[PDB]
Write a protein that binds this ligand. Structure first.
Ligand code: HEC
Ligand code: HEC
Lengths: 125, 125
């Protein structure tokens, strides 16, 4: 859907920005600094699950650019594993949110964050 | 969810970028320049419906900035009407996509685009 590689870069940066807001806005909740409303979090995690499926299709071959490392492309199977593993961490977060289980939410949130940090150290300049 | 007004600006710009890609990538399909796969479009419009609910909460009071006109805030009921009417145009697009009805898709797509253009002329610098 991208006329030029720059358009893919702009898309994925935007998707990642949104994905980061939907994740990070729950930090006060997980820490107990903000109240836990199970319905609120269930709805937010549904938004996060949609967003978390979006960036990866905008790292197609030849879309080198932005803050992305060139290792994203040469090691296609491995980058894929990190994005697929991140989404299966998101599936666990959804399950926790759907259950309205704060303790399960906190644990799943920590796992998701670790997956963010890993892919970052690895595939972000 | 925004530490400073700039963070709201960045969020809404990103949401609007995503929303624009999910809408505009269907243009070749509506024009017949690309094939119509009803399942593909149904899934894409589901993504667009999620995205189309996101920008508006990032125009909260005091988040003046970006390319947004100051009329977004002083006329809160009217801006609201344009975003609510845009989303009800998206509901009609979803219905068309869910029905797998190309003619209904084209008509709904045109209505959505007109709603984009209107709010733009009005509330974008
Ligand atoms: C790889 C499988 C990643 C996972 C999982 C996550 N991110 Fe990441 N992120 C990744 C790359 C390769 C890039 C650079 C994209 C580019 O072309 O520039 C990024 C970027 C971000 C950004 C900055 C976006 C921008 O506006 O430019 C943020 C804020 C970000 N990523 C956050 C983030 C969070 C919180 C994640 C988990 C919820 C996460 N990312 C996962 C690669 C990957
Ligand atoms: C008001 C109710 C709007 C509707 C409906 C749509 N858009 Fe819009 N858009 C609007 C504003 C006020 C702004 C400026 C935001 C800012 O603070 O800068 C925008 C911006 C865009 C952008 C640019 C985003 C960026 O990266 O900076 C695009 C590409 C865009 N809008 C597209 C667009 C499309 C295609 C729409 C319908 C599917 C649409 N917008 C609706 C206000 C409103």
């Amino acid at each position: 859907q991208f006329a030029k590689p720059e358009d893919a870069v702009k898309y994925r940066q935007s998707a990642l920005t949104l994905m980061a807001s939907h994740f990070g806005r729950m930090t006060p909740v997980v820490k107990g600094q903000a109240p836990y409303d199970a319905a609120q979090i269930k709805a937010n995690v549904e938004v996060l699950k949609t967003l978390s499926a979006l960036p990866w299709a905008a790292f197609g071959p030849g879309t080198e650019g932005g803050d992305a490392r060139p290792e994203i492309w040469s090691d296609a199977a491995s980058f894929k594993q990190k994005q697929q593993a991140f989404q299966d961490n998101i599936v666990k977060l959804s399950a926790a949110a759907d259950a309205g289980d704060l303790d399960k939410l906190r644990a799943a949130f920590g796992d998701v964050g670790a997956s963010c940090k890993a892919c970052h150290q690895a595939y972000r300049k």
